[PDB]
Amino acid sequence: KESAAAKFERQHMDSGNSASSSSNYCNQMMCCRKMTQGKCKPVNTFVHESLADVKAVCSQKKVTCKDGQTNCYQSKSTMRITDCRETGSSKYPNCAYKTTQVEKHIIVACGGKPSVPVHFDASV
Amino acid sequence: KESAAAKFERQHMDSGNSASSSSNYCNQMMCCRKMTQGKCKPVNTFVHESLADVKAVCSQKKVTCKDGQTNCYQSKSTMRITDCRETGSSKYPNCAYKTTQVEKHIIVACGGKPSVPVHFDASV
């Protein structure tokens, strides 16, 4: 007769930090997308949304870039994205990144005609 | 000379949903935790935090269980959890789940002494 408490563990506990699955995503993707050459780009974000949607962002809410010259845009709705941050022990040419899967709004700078993202500003 | 736009794609686009490594996590978990035996448990949540940590929620803020019980407690801090929900194609004995990773407060029901979680109520 399984105890109600033990039942809770079997059904709801998994401290083995699930997300581990893609723990080396940043490590791999940060290498293939040639962003570890010479030095390790400290921070980087990946948007797993449809290229169309990201592009449609250019026609959303206009906002300032964390710079000082207006040209950035924030998404109406949030998008699945992956955050890659250089880890502590990381050392070129053996970069090491931490992978974090989140869902926030994105802010990009657009340009050209038609307008397309040309710069990734930040998220939230 | 790579165009700035194209540079954006190389550096920030991975439209192919990077949650595949984890897009079948609930399927494995719902399986091994005996929640697909006899019938597919429709909804279920996994707390990706230390046990001891969760157990402390038993002594955090007090709350009203979704129904109306007086006990129950709500974690003061959010936690990494995963949401598993039976898909539309799911039909015993072929349980199929959708994996949703989120961070939020959980609501539990405690019991016995010392108090330990004996039931998962909800989250927000």
Curated annotation (Swiss-Prot), chains A, B:
It is an enzyme of class 4 (lyase). One of its GO terms (biological process) is defense response to Gram-positive bacterium. It is found in: Secreted. Substrate binds at residues 7, 10, 41-45, 66, 85. Seminal plasma. Can reach 3% of the protein content of this fluid. Disulfide bonds join 26-84, 40-95, 58-110, 65-72. Its EC number is 4.6.1.18. One of its GO terms (cellular component) is extracellular region. It comes from the Eukaryota. The keyword Secreted applies. The keyword DNA-binding does not apply. It catalyses: an [RNA] containing cytidine + H2O = an [RNA]-3'-cytidine-3'-phosphate + a 5'-hydroxy-ribonucleotide-3'-[RNA]; an [RNA] containing uridine + H2O = an [RNA]-3'-uridine-3'-phosphate + a 5'-hydroxy-ribonucleotide-3'-[RNA]. Allosteric regulation by both substrate and reaction products. Its main location: secreted. Keywords: Allosteric enzyme, Disulfide bond, Endonuclease, Hydrolase, Lyase, Nuclease, Secreted, Signal. The active site is at residues 12, 119. GO terms for molecular function: identical protein binding; lyase activity; nucleic acid binding; ribonuclease A activity; RNA nuclease activity. The modification Deamidated asparagine is found at residue 67. Homodimer; disulfide-linked. Belongs to the pancreatic ribonuclease family. This enzyme hydrolyzes both single- and double-stranded RNA. This is Seminal ribonuclease. The gene is SRN. The chain holds residues 27 to 150 of 150 of the full protein.
